[PDB]
Write a protein that binds this ligand. Structure first.
Ligand SMILES: Nc1nc2c(ncn2[C@@H]2O[C@H](COP(=O)(O)OP(=O)(O)CP(=O)(O)O)[C@@H](O)[C@H]2O)c(=O)[nH]1
Ligand SMILES: [Mg+2]
Lengths: 296, 393
């Protein structure tokens, strides 16, 4: 099943990354940041530019070409929206274990078709689209998140929001806890990784002792995450889970209603999640939860 | 993006979907000129608002209904005068209502039976899904909650498309019997094909009606369009009136800036919708009321930082601007010069609290503090919020 690919979410220093849209404006900037941060970026792809050199790395025409030459196991996509979906497909065809699509603005219909095939295979794991990426602090950085605010630690962070994730990261470093793995699942309705996918990895990662879940109003992703924690996290090896839901003060067809922050907060709490009402207290809340449980 | 009823109705007819002949009028006397232009056995008056629930909604004049039915064009001008210009407060509009600038006069048809049908992309259903109920017309959410068994769903395979067996089954569950089953199933197919063609996130027809002559007709339509697909739906997005949005909202969009107005005095300039809401959330926490937030999006260009200040300051209600940029794709020092340059070139009055934490922040803060401008730097989100509520004394 597609859940078999969940494992590929936990990148490490040995992950060899290629950049789809390498010579593009975005790809260049974030590829430099990836190299300076120490990520094993081993090349990229741009149609019609195979053979040239970019940032001291080889450029290829196709993803499969880049994979057999560099043995890449992860791919990051910055292709514009009109062709980003096809870029995900190119990576799945090449059986790239991990694909991270940063691009924002992909038509929902395109991702519905992409996810249709994605769920029928278990070799490739997609993160995104419209997400900041995934980062193993100090070992691997695949995305647009600022690296300097991270520090390898003990808190696994999963966030449905973009830049808001960085607040939870910066705070967990200032309190001295750091982060084991941070995953931004993106803000699009049809994506390759949801909350439960990341929570599964966190609950089975020894390095991850605490968990921070960043959410916001809309949909039922936070509700589903709550149900997942209620059954799998309630137990002796229960790990503390903290969360913040953005849009508490935000103001408010019929098909969507047929098949709301307050409901999210109450649902997460029922599963044992400690919900910080302030976006600036994610680090202090998880820190004191570690203190309550004598985990420091 | 959402279009009015008279705009969605046109798209449906062009793709083989049966809808009512209609005309739109901006005045009450012109609604009488159009009612006579129909040559109709009966005329339907339907207030044009992008919100639903017009049937049992009341205007600010006393008229108890955003939808009326009459047989004489003279009554439309009387009812149209009780619609145009007024706020229509329904179940799904703000308690203040939404100003009704247009009304629809259409060749009214008799409705033997009302059903509900909707096509939308649903995350749980993993792609498109047909949602229908025989208990259509007026409140659909009431029957959906009371009797869930009266809601029928048909998940459509995006690759295979809508199959005959699925359209026939849905049409039968909606209560379409006899020769009307294949006719409805054919309209369901043409609706789904339209749903995919126009890159819609939701196509809702309520009532999916049935006339006494045996004609399956979509009487009302609410089409929601995927904003991400505008690059391949140019003709459709050109139809967006934009009049139901605040003028500043449309002005910010010119520079790729999404604006969300609020009832406060502390303007917010943030990159990321999730962070913008969190910024607003923490302002309330410290007693402040954010006037709005101007989401910047990942793409930062020093031209729009200049504009952003212009739009926020254009609103006199803004007594302070909170800049919170964390983790942008552009160097902070570049945004620092755009802020100063914008301040220098615009003569800023309101106090300015700036929080920058992206790349190369040490230099950026120096550019701001050593500029001689009314700029107080902030360290974290909590600091910027507390400093924003303090500057509104
Ligand atoms: N005879 C006749 N009745 C009509 C016509 N159009 C609407 N009606 C009646 O007026 C009602 C108005 O409903 P409508 O405006 O479509 O929707 P609504 O009240 O806003 C509720 P929802 O948003 O779920 O559609 C219909 O349910 C129907 O009973 C028409 O052309 N002929
Ligand atoms: Mg309707």
């Amino acid at each position: 099943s597609y859940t078999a690919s969940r494992k590929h979410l936990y990148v490490d220093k040995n992950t060899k990354v290629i950049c789809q849209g390498f010579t593009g404006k975005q790809g260049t900037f974030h590829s430099q940041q990836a190299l300076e941060y120490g990520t094993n970026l081993v090349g990229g792809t741009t149609p019609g530019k195979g053979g040239k050199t970019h940032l001291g790395l080889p450029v290829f025409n196709t993803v499969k070409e880049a994979k057999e030459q560099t043995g890449a196991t992860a791919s990051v996509i910055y292709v514009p929206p009109p062709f980003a979906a096809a870029a995900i497909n190119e990576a799945i065809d090449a059986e790239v274990p991990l694909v991270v699509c940063i691009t924002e603005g992909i038509p929902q219909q395109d991702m519905v078709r992409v996810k249709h095939r994605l769920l029928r295979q278990g070799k490739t794991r997609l993160i995104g689209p419209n997400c900041p990426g995934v980062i193993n602090p100090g070992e691997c950085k695949i995305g647009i998140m600022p690296g300097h605010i991270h520090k390898k630690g003990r808190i696994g962070i999963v966030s449905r929001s973009g830049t808001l994730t960085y607040e939870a990261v910066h705070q967990t470093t200032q309190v001295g806890l750091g982060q084991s793995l941070c995953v931004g699942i993106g803000g699009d309705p049809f994506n390759g990784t949801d909350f439960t996918d990341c929570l599964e990895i966190f609950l089975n990662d020894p390095a991850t002792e605490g968990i921070i879940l960043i959410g916001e109003i809309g949909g039922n992703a936070e509700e589903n995450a709550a149900e997942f924690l209620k059954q799998h996290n309630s137990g002796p090896k229960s790990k503390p889970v903290v969360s913040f839901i953005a849009g508490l003060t935000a103001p408010p067809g019929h098909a969507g209603a047929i098949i709301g922050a307050k409901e999210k907060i109450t649902a997460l709490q029922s599963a044992g999640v400690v919900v910080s009402m302030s976006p600036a207290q994610l680090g202090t809340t998880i820190y004191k939860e570690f203190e309550k449980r004598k985990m420091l | 993006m959402n279009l009015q009823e008279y705009q969605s109705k046109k798209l449906m007819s062009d793709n083989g979907v049966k809808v009512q002949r209609f005309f739109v009028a901006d005045t009450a006397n012109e609604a009488l000129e159009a009612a006579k232009r129909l040559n109709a056995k009966e005329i339907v008056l339907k207030a044009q608002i992008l919100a639903g629930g017009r049937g049992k909604g009341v205007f600010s004049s006393g008229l108890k209904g955003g939808v009326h039915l009459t047989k004489d064009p003279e009554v439309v001008g009387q009812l149209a005068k009780q619609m145009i210009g007024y706020n229509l407060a329904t179940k799904q509009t703000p308690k203040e209502g939404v100003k009704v600038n247009k009304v629809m006069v259409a060749e009214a048809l008799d409705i033997s039976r009302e059903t509900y049908l909707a096509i939308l992309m649903d995350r749980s259903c993993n792609g498109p899904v047909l949602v229908g109920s025989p208990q259509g017309g007026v409140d659909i959410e009431e029957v959906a909650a009371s009797n869930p068994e009266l809601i029928f769903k048909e998940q459509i395979d995006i690759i295979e498309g809508i199959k005959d067996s699925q359209a026939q089954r849905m049409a039968e569950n909606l209560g379409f019997l006899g020769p009307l089953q294949n006719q409805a199933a054919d309209q369901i197919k043409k609706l789904y094909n339209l749903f995919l063609k126009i890159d819609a996130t939701q196509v809702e027809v309520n009532p999916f009606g049935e006339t006494p002559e045996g004609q399956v007709v979509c009487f009302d339509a609410k089409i929601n369009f995927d904003d991400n697909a505008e690059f391949r739906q140019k003709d459709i997005f050109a139809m967006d009136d934009k009049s139901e949005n605040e003028p500043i909202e449309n002005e910010a969009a010119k520079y790729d800036l999404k604006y969300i107005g609020l009832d406060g005095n502390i303007a917010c300039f943030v990159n990321g919708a999730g962070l913008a809401m969190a910024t607003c959330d923490i302002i309330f926490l410290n007693g402040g009321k954010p006037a709005n937030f101007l989401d910047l999006g990942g793409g930062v260009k020093e031209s729009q930082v200049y504009q952003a200040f212009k739009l926020l300051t254009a609103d006199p209600k803004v007594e302070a601007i909170l800049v919170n940029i964390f983790g942008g794709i552009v160097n902070c020092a570049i945004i620092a010069n755009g802020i100063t340059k914008a301040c220098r070139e615009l003569e800023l009055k309101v106090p300015l609290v700036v929080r920058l934490e992206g790349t190369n922040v040490h230099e950026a803060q120096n550019i701001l503090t050593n500029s001689g401008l009314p700029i107080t730097s902030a360290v974290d989100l909590e600091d910027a919020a507390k400093k924003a509520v303090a500057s509104v004394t």
